[PDB]
Scaffold this active site. Sequence first.
Site, short mmCIF file in Angstrom:
data_model
loop_
_atom_site.label_atom_id
_atom_site.label_comp_id
_atom_site.label_asym_id
_atom_site.label_seq_id
_atom_site.Cartn_x
_atom_site.Cartn_y
_atom_site.Cartn_z
N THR A 104 0.88 -1.27 -0.05
CA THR A 104 0.10 0.07 -0.02
C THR A 104 0.84 1.18 -0.18
O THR A 104 1.98 1.24 0.61
CB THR A 104 -0.91 0.00 1.12
N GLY A 133 -0.76 0.70 6.05
CA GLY A 133 -0.78 0.01 7.22
C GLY A 133 -2.14 -0.54 7.69
O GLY A 133 -2.36 -0.98 8.91
N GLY A 134 -2.74 -1.25 6.74
CA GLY A 134 -4.09 -2.15 7.10
C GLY A 134 -5.04 -1.46 8.02
O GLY A 134 -5.23 -0.47 7.94
N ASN A 135 -5.10 -2.26 8.81
CA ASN A 135 -6.35 -1.92 9.72
C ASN A 135 -5.66 -1.02 10.96
O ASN A 135 -6.30 -0.83 11.70
CB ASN A 135 -6.72 -3.37 10.36
N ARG A 136 -4.43 -0.71 10.50
CA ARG A 136 -4.09 0.40 11.77
C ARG A 136 -4.14 1.88 11.19
O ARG A 136 -3.75 2.74 11.89
CB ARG A 136 -2.60 0.07 12.15
N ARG A 161 9.43 4.65 5.55
CA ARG A 161 9.01 4.03 4.27
C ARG A 161 9.98 4.81 3.06
O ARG A 161 9.61 4.78 1.81
CB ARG A 161 7.82 3.77 3.54
#
Lengths: 286, 167
Positions: free
Chosen positions: B1, B69-72, B160
Amino acid sequence: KGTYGVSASHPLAVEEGMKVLKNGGSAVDAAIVVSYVLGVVELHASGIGGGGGMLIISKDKETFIDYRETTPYFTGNQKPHIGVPGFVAGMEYIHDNYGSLPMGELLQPAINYAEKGFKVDDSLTMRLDLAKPRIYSDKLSIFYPNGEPIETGETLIQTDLARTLKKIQKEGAKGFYEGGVARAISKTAKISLEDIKGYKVEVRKPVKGNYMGYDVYTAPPPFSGVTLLQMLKLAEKKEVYKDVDHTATYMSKMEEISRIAYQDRKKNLGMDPNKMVSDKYISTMK
Amino acid sequence: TTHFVIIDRDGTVVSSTNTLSNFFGTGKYTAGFFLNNQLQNEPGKRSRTFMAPTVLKKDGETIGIGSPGGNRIPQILTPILDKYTHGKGSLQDIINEYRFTFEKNTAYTEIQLSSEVKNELSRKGLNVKKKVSPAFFGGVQALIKDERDNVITGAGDGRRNGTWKSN
Ligand SMILES: N[C@@H](CCC(=O)O)C(=O)N[C@@H](CCC(=O)O)C(=O)O
């Protein structure tokens, strides 16, 4: 001149974005360039085999373009859990409806990095090392020369990808969603040709709310602008900022704000988002 | 992502997040690219994602921001926007602050914390865990345009190798 900027997860994407902007391009023309560059130089994180979403806010217009991958028709089990990619359709849609510059030119800087190469950074070499136990095979040899992750400083060249990008540049979306690229996707993913061919972008209204005097525009379902905006507004209501200097308090309250909003999100899966984000709806939360 | 933000000459802002879901998606690779992995959250439908490209607007301020960071994702962005709106300092500075996220009674930390704090949080049923992966805490990218006059500034997440530029 005219003020302008780019923020992005790779310096080559920032560089190409600024290039378009420097020469007088719009934010959406720059956006197509950056997205395609990122799929080449930050290939682990995004690319033409995935999807995403774009919020466009201008002086008097708001849009949210949703080019997320969609489920294929599939009768047995499992199969491989791969959606029809939406990225290339997304950039095209965005370009046709909001772009100025001609599309071929927007693909060109990514083609150049795929074609002629770019220098690999820390994060890419690290990502490759972490993925090796899962993904490594001989098909992936350009990424693991001599069985090891390509090192920081080396030049990665992606001739296959350049070819695909050129096919898209020449033909538009057809170059991905039909013809040889589509047959390759069909064979690898086990998704019918007709499924690939039928991909459609969804256009949606942004979730509009306010926080701290700000109008906030954000991503509607199936994205989670709602949860975020909820969390933001709860935090401003019960000003956990007054606990910022006390770590355990600050953390403690964030932890609360987060299960409040995640719980809410979940019983919204177990039709108006603007409602779920208003001072009154937030009032009624705990 | 991956998330990025663009602001042009006439103050149009784009805030966009693209993804394969996993790093490299399923790892399946064809015609030069990686195929996405689709997280199961019926044929032609999209799954739920935590992604949240967002724009903030006041008179004399335009903010575009987002993060992987997905569900964070909302947990990553909430503290930053909180600190930022409450005058705590430059956006870049705030992106640089160490971070924490919660998964059901586990608090995950970027930087290891003191006994004092670890006890206070143990008392609320939470068990602090420090995490190795810097990318676990996101990759926040943001731009800010103000009407003084105008100046664009922004933030790139060094976790990143992210960055930003304005003219
Ligand atoms: N641990 C995974 C899955 C968790 C989830 O919320 O789905 C994860 O964090 N995945 C991410 C990997 C790529 C990234 O840039 O964060 C994701 O965003 O899907």
